[PDB]
Amino acid sequence: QLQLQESGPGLVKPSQTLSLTCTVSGGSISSGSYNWTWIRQPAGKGLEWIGRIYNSGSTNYNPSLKSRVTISVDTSKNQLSLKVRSVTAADTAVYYCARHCSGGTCYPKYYYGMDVWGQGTTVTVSSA
Amino acid sequence: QSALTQPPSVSEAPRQRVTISCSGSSSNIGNNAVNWYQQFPGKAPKLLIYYDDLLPSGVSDRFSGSKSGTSASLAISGVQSEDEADYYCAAWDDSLNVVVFGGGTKLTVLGQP
Amino acid sequence: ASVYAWNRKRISNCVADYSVLYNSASFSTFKCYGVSPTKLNDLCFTNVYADSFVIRGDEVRQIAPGQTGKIADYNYKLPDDFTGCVIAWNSNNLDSKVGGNYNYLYRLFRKSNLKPFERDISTEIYQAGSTPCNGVEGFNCYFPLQSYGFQPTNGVGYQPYRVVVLSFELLHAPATVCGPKKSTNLVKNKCVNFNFNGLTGTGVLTESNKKFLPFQQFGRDIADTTDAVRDPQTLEILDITPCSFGGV
Amino acid sequence: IRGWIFGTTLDSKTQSLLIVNNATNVVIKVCEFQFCNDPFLGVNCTFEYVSFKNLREFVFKNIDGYFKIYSKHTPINLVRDLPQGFSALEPLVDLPIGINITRFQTLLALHAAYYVGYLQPRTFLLKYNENGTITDAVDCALDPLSE
Ligand SMILES: *[C@@H]1O[C@H](CO)[C@@H](O[C@@H]2O[C@H](CO)[C@@H](O[C@@H]3O[C@H](CO[C@H]4O[C@H](CO)[C@@H](O)[C@H](O)[C@@H]4O)[C@@H](O)[C@H](O[C@H]4O[C@H](CO)[C@@H](O)[C@H](O)[C@@H]4O)[C@@H]3O)[C@H](O)[C@H]2NC(C)=O)[C@H](O)[C@H]1NC(C)=O
Ligand SMILES: *[C@@H]1O[C@H](CO)[C@@H](O[C@@H]2O[C@H](CO)[C@@H](O)[C@H](O)[C@H]2NC(C)=O)[C@H](O)[C@H]1NC(C)=O
Ligand SMILES: *[C@@H]1O[C@H](CO)[C@@H](O)[C@H](O)[C@H]1NC(C)=O
Ligand SMILES: *[C@@H]1O[C@H](CO)[C@@H](O)[C@H](O)[C@H]1NC(C)=O
Ligand SMILES: *[C@@H]1O[C@H](CO)[C@@H](O)[C@H](O)[C@H]1NC(C)=O
Ligand SMILES: *[C@@H]1O[C@H](CO)[C@@H](O)[C@H](O)[C@H]1NC(C)=O
C-alpha cells in the first residue's frame, strides 16, 4: 500500500514560480535506498527527467533546467515538493513524481527501476 | 534528451511477436542499465522491464527485455488487446547526467474489429 | 549448479563416446565452435572439460564466443578462440517449483568482466556509488547475486535451461581422450586390407600356432616385415601372408 | 619396500607419481601429495588406479612424456648381493603423464636393499629364443669382442 499523492494548482502564471507537492502514503518517505525524482511530460510528447533528491537533502537536476528548479523533502509532512521558477509556455506538461531505487534496502528489490509513480498533476502555464 | 530513439508506432496481428528496439549511445545504454515503462492513455507510466531484462511481479511473462551493445529491445510474444499502450525505454546518460527517455512506441494490435 | 558457480568436470583417461549426443534428440540447443560434431569421434584431445550450469532461454544465446550480457560478462565467459560445443535443453519440468524455484542464482553486478573460463563466487557488496560499502548494503551497495524466478507458467525465454559446455584442449602433451571406433568382422583365408591397432597392410589372415607373450602385440620376420598380429578382441594369433603375386 | 615416489620437489607444489602396493592392492596416483619430511609406511589429481627370496627389478624412463615401467619377478636365494645372471624385463604399464621427473625416492615399511642405475644410449644385440623371450644380450660397447 505504497501510494504517492500529487497536489498543486492547475494554472500557474508565466514568469512566476510553480509549486507542486508529492505526498507519500503507506510508509515513510525517508526509509529505503530511493532516489525521489520528478518527471514532466508535455501532452503528446515524451517524458522529461527534471531532477532528483536523495540521502538527506543532496540533489541533482537536469542541466538544461538546473538553475530554475528546486526539489525539497519535508520529512515531518512525509512529502517531497517541486519548485519551478520563472516558468514559460514551454513548461506546460503533465508532471509526475516517482521513486528510483539505488540500493539493497528496497522492497521490492527492483534495482534501477522507478518503482511507484504518482497519478500526475496537469500544469498549464498561461495567464488566462 | 532524445538520446534514446524508438519507432513511433509498431503494429502486428494478434498472437504474433513484436520487437520494440531502443537505440542509444555508449554514454547511456552502453554503460548503464536500461529500464522499460508502459504508459496507457490518460495514466502514469508503469514499470514494465527493469535493469535491462528483469520482470516485476504482476507483469505478464509475455514481456521480455534484451540488450546488446548500445541498443536494447523489448519483445512481447503473444500480442493482445490488453497490450495497446505507449512503451518508453529509459537509461542514465553519463554525458548528460540525466535519465534519458525514448520517444515512445505505440503498440496497436491489428486484429481489432 | 548456478551459472555464477558453474561446475566443471574433468574428463581424462577414457574413450569418449559422443553417441549420447547424437542419439539423444532431447536437446534444444546444439552449437559447436572450432570443431565439428561429426568429425569428433575420430579425434584426440589432451583433456576435455565439461562445464554445467542453469540459465533461462533468453540467456542460452549468450553461451558463445564473442557474446555480451550478464551471463557472458559476469557469470560464464568463453574465449574468442573457444573450441568446443554448447548443448542446452529445456529443463522446466525439473528446475521449476509451483512457488518458484529460487535455488539457482546468478551474478548481477561486478566491477569488471570475467576472464575466459573464470568462476567468481565472491559475495562482496558491490559499490556502485561514491560511498564505500563496508560489507553492508544500502545506497549504491547491492548484493552481487540475484535469484532466478523459475515457475511452470513462465515464458519460454524465462524457463530454466540446463547447459553443458564441452571444451577441447590440445597441448604439447599426450592425448588420453580420443574417441571410440567401430570394428568390423574378421575374414580369414581371403586377401583383405587389415588395420590392427592402427597398423595397416594387405595380406591373407590365417590361424597360427605362434605363442605370443601377453605383452607382445605384433610379430616380425628377418626382413622386419609384419609376420603376425594378435586380434585385439579375441586373444588369438593370426598369421599375415601377403596376397598371392608373381608373373605371367 | 612397498612403493616409489617420482617428481621434482615432492612437497605438494608439483605433480608427483606415487605407487603404493599394500598387501594385495597396487595403488598408483599422480596427485600433488604433501609428503612427510621422511616418507615411510608403518606396519588436483589427474589419474588414479587401484588393482632374500624375491628379486623385483624395475626400469623407469620418460620418452616424449610417456612414463614406461618394466619389471620382472623371479625367485632367488641370496641375501648378500644381486644374483648373477640374465633376465629380461617385460613392459607392464605406460602412463602418458607428460611430467618432468628429475628426482625419486623409495618407500620402506617400518615396524631390504635396493640398487639405482642409469640408462645410456647404448646399442644392444638382443637374442630372442623360439618363444620370443630374450635370453642373452651383447652390449656393443663393452669391449672389442662385444663390438
Ligand atoms: C541515485 O542518486 C545517486 C546520487 O546522484 C546516484 O549515485 C551515483 O551513481 C553514479 C553512477 O552509478 C556514481 O558514479 C560512479 O561512482 C564511482 C566513484 O567512486 C570513486 O571513489 C571510490 C572511493 O571513494 C572508489 O572506490 C571508486 O573506484 C571511484 O574512485 C566511479 O567508480 C564510477 O566510475 C566512473 O569512473 C571511471 C574511471 O574511474 C569510468 O571509467 C567509469 O566509466 C565511470 O565514469 C562513477 O564515477 C556516483 O559516484 C554516485 N554518487 C553518489 C553520491 O553515490 C545513483 O546512481 C542514483 N541511482 C539511480 C537508480 O538513479
Ligand atoms: C618440462 O621440461 C621442458 C624442457 O625443459 C619444458 O619445456 C620448456 O618450456 C618453456 C615454456 O613452456 C620454454 O621456454 C623452454 O624453452 C622449454 N624447454 C626447452 C628445452 O625447449 C616444459 O615446459 C617442462 N614442463 C613443465 C610442466 O614444467
Ligand atoms: C571382449 O571380447 C572377449 C571375447 O569374447 C570377451 O571375452 C571379453 O570379455 C570382452 N570384453 C569385455 C569388457 O567384456
Ligand atoms: C592401500 O593404499 C590406498 C592408497 O592410499 C588406500 O586407499 C588403501 O586403503 C590401502 N589399503 C588397501 C588394503 O588397499
Ligand atoms: C593442477 O595440475 C595441473 C597440471 O597439469 C595444473 O595445470 C593446474 O593448474 C593445477 N591446478 C591447481 C588448482 O593446482
Ligand atoms: C616355449 O614354451 C613351451 C611351452 O609353452 C616349452 O615347452 C618350450 O621349451 C619353450 N621354449 C624354450 C626355448 O624354452
Q: Closest-CA residue in chain C for B61?
A: C155
DSSP lists the bridge partners of residue D103 as: D7
CB contact under 8 A, A104 and C129: no
| Mutation choice for ligand 4 from D18, D19, D27, CB with most ligand atoms inside 8 A | D27
List the chains bordering chain C where 3 or more Cβ pairs fall under 8 Å: A, B, D
CB contact under 8 A, B47 and A112: no
Distances (CA, A) of D101 to C99, D7, D10, D14, D62: 57, 5, 11, 10, 8
Min Cα–Cα distance to chain B from C202, Å: 59
Nearest beta carbon to residue B44 from set A60, A62, A96: A96
Nearest beta carbon to residue B64 from set C69, C108, C158: C158
Residue A63 DSSP class: G
Using an 8 Å CB-CB cutoff, list chain A residues near B88.
Answer: 46-47
d(CA D126, CA D123): 10
The single-letter code of the amino acid at D34 is: Q
Q: What is the 3-state secondary structure (H, E, C) of chain C?
A: CECCCCEEEEECCCCCCCHHHHHCCCCCEEEEECCCCHHHCCCCECEEEEEEEEEEHHHHCCCCCCCCCHHHHHCCCCCCCCCEEEEEEECCCCCCCCCCECCCEEECCCCCCCCCCCCCCCCCCEECCCCCCCCCCECCEECCEEECCECCCCCHHHCEEEEEEEEEECCCCCCCECCCCCCCCCCCCCEEEEEECCEEEEEEEEECCCCCCCCCCEEECCCCCEEEEECCCCCCEEEEECCCCCCC
d(CA A107, CA C163): 32
d(CA D54, CA D56): 6
| Mutation choice for ligand 6 from D128, D130, D135, CB with most ligand atoms inside 8 A | D130
Taking the CA atoms of residue C43, residue C49, residue C54 and residue C56 in that order, the dihedral angle to the nearest 10 degrees is -50
CB contact under 8 A, A117 and B98: no
CB contact under 8 A, D131 and C216: no
Q: Which of B53, B72, B56 is nearest to B64 (CA)?
A: B53
Report phi then psi at A19, rounded to 5.
-140, 125
Q: In what order do the strands lie in the sheet with A79-84?
A: A3-7, A18-25, A79-84, A69-74
- Count of structural domains within chain B: 1
Cis peptide before D39 (omega within 30 of 0): no
d(CA A32, CA D143): 94
The single-letter code of the amino acid at D12 is: S
Q: In what order do the strands lie in the sheet with D103-107?
A: D48-50, D25-29, D17-22, D3-7, D103-107
D99 CA to middle of ligand 5, Å? Answer: 12
- Count of structural domains within chain A: 1
Greatest alpha-carbon span in chain B:
47
Experimental technique for the deposited model: cryo-EM
Does B33 lie at the interface with C, CB-CB under 8 angstroms? no
Q: Are strands A59-61 and A121-125 parallel, antiparallel or unpaired?
A: unpaired
d(CA C231, CA C206): 12
Does B75 lie at the interface with C, CB-CB under 8 angstroms? yes
CB D46, CB D30: distance < 8 Å: yes
Min Cα–Cα distance to chain B from A38, Å: 11
A15 CA to middle of ligand 1, Å? Answer: 36
Side-chain-facing half-sphere of A35: CA atoms under 13 Å: 26
Using an 8 Å CB-CB cutoff, list chain C residues near A111.
Answer: 108, 142
Residue B81 DSSP class: G
CB C40, CB C33: distance < 8 Å: no
| 3-state secondary structure at position D95 | strand
Record the cell numbers describing residue C114, joined without a space.
570475467
- Cβ contacts of residue C23 below 8 Å, gap of 6+? none
DSSP lists the bridge partners of residue D136 as: D127
Residue A10 DSSP class: S
Q: Closest-CA residue in chain A for B101?
A: A47
Taking the CA atoms of residue D120, residue D125, residue D129 and residue D131 in that order, the dihedral angle to the nearest 10 degrees is 50
- Which range marks the domain in which residue B80 is found? 1-113
CB contact under 8 A, B61 and C58: no
- Which range marks the domain in which residue A46 is found? 3-125
Q: What is the CATH number of the domain that holds A28?
A: 2.60.40.10
Sign of the Cα torsion D78, D79, D81, D87 reads positive
- Cβ contacts of residue A76 below 8 Å, gap of 6+? none
Q: Closest-CA residue in chain A for C144?
A: A104
- Cβ contacts of residue A14 below 8 Å, gap of 6+? A87, A88, A89, A125, A126, A127
